[PDB]
Design a protein around this nucleic acid. Sequence first.
RNA 1: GUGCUACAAGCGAAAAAGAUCGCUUGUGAUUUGCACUCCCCUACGUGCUGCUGAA
DNA 2: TCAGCAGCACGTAGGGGAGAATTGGC
DNA 3: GCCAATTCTCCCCTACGT
Length: 930
Amino acid sequence: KWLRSYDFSLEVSEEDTLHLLECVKEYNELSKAYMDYMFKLKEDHKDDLDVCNLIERLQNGSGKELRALASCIFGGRKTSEDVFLRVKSYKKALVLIDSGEVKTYEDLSKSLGEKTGLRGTNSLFKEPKKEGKRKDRTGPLKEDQAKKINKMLAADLGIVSALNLCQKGLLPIPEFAKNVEKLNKNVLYGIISQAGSRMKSFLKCDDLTQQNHLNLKEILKSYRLEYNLDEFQEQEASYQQWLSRMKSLNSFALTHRFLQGWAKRWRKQFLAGKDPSWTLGEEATKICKEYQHLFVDNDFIYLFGKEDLLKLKVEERKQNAQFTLPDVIKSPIYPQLGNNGQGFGIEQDNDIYLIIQSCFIDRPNIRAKIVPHKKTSVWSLEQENTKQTKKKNAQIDKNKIPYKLFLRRAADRYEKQIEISECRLQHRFCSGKANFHVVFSLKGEANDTLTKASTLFLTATQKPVSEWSKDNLPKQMRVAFVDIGLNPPLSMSIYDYNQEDNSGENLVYAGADQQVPFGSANFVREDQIGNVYNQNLKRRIEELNDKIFYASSCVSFYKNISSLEGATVELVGGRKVMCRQFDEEKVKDLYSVPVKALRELGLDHFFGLPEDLDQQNVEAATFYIENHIHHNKLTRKSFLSFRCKLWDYIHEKILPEFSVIRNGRHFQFNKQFCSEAYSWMFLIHSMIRLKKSLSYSHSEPLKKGEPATFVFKNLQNYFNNFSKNVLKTVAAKLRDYCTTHNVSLCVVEDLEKFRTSSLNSKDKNRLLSIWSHRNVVQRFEEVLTEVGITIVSNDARHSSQLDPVTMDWAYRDEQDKSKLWVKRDGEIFHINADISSTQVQAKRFFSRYADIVYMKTLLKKDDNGSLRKLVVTRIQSYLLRTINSQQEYNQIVGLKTSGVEEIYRHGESWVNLITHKTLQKEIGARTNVQ
RNA sequence: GUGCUACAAGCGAAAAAGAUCGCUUGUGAUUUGCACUCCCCUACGUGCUGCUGAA
DNA sequence: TCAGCAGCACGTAGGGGAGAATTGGC
DNA sequence: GCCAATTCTCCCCTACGT
């Protein structure tokens, strides 16, 4: 049910390593040959209704069928009789039972009779499962047997189709039959299994992509048919003329952003009687004004520009999935040793040795030592491995396939038992020398009833909770609600649910709106397992970060004001350097010159901006720069000095600091989780960006798919590994916290629609690129399913904007993110932010969203100019609970909707966004009074 | 075992490079303590990043 | 404060995978 | 005796917003 991986290096001799390289190359060659032959059969042949059946069985079958057909893909089948009897008997069984004259197992067993293939041990006879149960039978037929006899026959008929292909003279792959003499058959089965898995994945992907292109065609047809663009020939002609006139200019494009902005710009500012021209252009604004006279009262552009977007999107999308064959060094295939593939064994005096069977014939088995891990408390096998006088040497045997390895290191919390039945061989070519690792997976069966039983807390309070979940919840279960903000890495709260007690502070109902008072919940305690550690490290990191951003902005300004294409290499300061020209018909349309960057770098003197300036005024700055160009020569020498000084700054004030703090061994996470790991994660990305600027600058762009000049390996690998380490450490902290406080359920927030718990930066460059919410949730699932604690995700919109107790809209102050200002008795107090988010999520959970404070109502207008303000399952349940709410509703729905807005609740009133922000400002302004 | 976790000089890509990658020699390292589901294949989305143009 | 055109990480969703027991010629 | 070849696939019950 859950498999966790572990990688162990191997130490082998040079002869052994050459043997394994030969084996791996053979695997790759054979796998590529198999997939390529299958592709050739797919393309060249699509007739006879036989090859298509085999491709269908490979596409929609299990590994068991791959093993069944392997005996035909290579060589042949010794016996080809029992399958025909099996398909005949199963066809007759399907014809029977469908008659309905029998309703028992015994009648069917006599109906088949004897010599019906089916060599015992199958579901339709005696259903032995694994025990056999002394030939027990259920009695009457169920539905699942009649359902699955069909897939059983599908498998048998696929094997028959492969038999027919072989008998025709097309199935035995010439390469496989050529190699079969010199290679063991176990290897052939393993290669067939792995290559078939890869090809099945590819075939499903290709099917999905073709269906996607068909769906795109269908949706474009629906769009072009619903809007009747063919009927409006004149409107289409006018729209096409407008598009051509726009495309005449060199600064026009058609995009979803343009269409989204058109509705806000032209449909709104046109009523003011003046042209907005918000970065719209000079000729473009005049053309738009001239053409809009035909459709002043409507919006033809919004409804006409989407067709061209659909056409170009349909053109651009790929048709058939791109096909990659396996390569030993590019697209690796990794042998999966086992009883159905390459043989393997494990033997123990005090070192554990792995014996791998050779690919070829008449070659010895290979012996490796499983080199242990960094600090191994216990490390042992289970079989008796006492030394003797070479009873069997290195023997690979079945009857011992599930090897039992006990291992426990320092970081583990419990002795780990791994039942090896397959082991993966992996090859790495680091430093030009091949090395081998064996990968072992440990398996576990995790109980799967807590998720379903927790689903009863997510019902809408309009229908009774699912009965099968009402009787499976633990009686005295303890829940935890977690928030995963950035600066405080983790913040949780713990609640105690008592089925028996019905008088706790939180009450939960498991029926209609207020019915069946099923239990009650209490609050225990809330914690946060992050701290700032030392403030010096955080201060240094922040200073380096804004220094980096200042330097990057300065280099952007330097590039923008320059020209290039006439760059000169001149020996200045003992270095050849390379600077770009300055005379390029300088224009007065520059952006905000990085005045703060020019302050901090010390480069203002070169450009001669006085102290008298601000951070937004550019016309005065432009005039001052022009006057400096006039009065001062500001020749290429000044630009040369400016560039040299900025390069000197970036190489003597940034890189030494970054190195010295990187090599300082701060993020070792010993006895304390440092909150500065996240700031470091950001700064590594910033460093990558800066070094990219230092690398690709002053270069011609890449052309016609030429290979990339640079790779940026060290820094990228550093960033990735740092992110993985910090995620793992946070997950381990959460797991230990839950397990040390007797928690059975963890509740997380789904925030893809709106993110509030993370940073509130307007720019998206600093979010969803360094820290992934989805990976945090995935790691939590992975590390908690191991111990037996389940996590469930719930909606957390406006989590940190609500009062934990009164459910009022509290104020998130802009100065600090760690204080929420709340009134309860006419006075305002500050409460912890993320802790309060956990509290409100808990309140929403235990009451299964009894009260809502956010709805999206749509404005409805008719030909009479009236308004209706119609609202849009938990929401409908809420209405059904408070206002208790048809034909008039469909009548309003049929009316045209002017637009979509939202309504916010503040007690007994439902307000708009403007007045809601006004009320939040009202509740938050009293902070400065006190 | 990996990863928290590499610094300077040579030379070659190479015509500019203080960036990136590859080699050869230096130099502290040696874990001082934490954690560790790991392989491929798609499609399409983001930003990154140079060159150029626009209000 | 975006536009176009080459490379390029990683997301973000998907798609495969970490097999056991029987049975004739030996 | 015995290893290549060849048949094997269930047992459940669960939500909700984009």
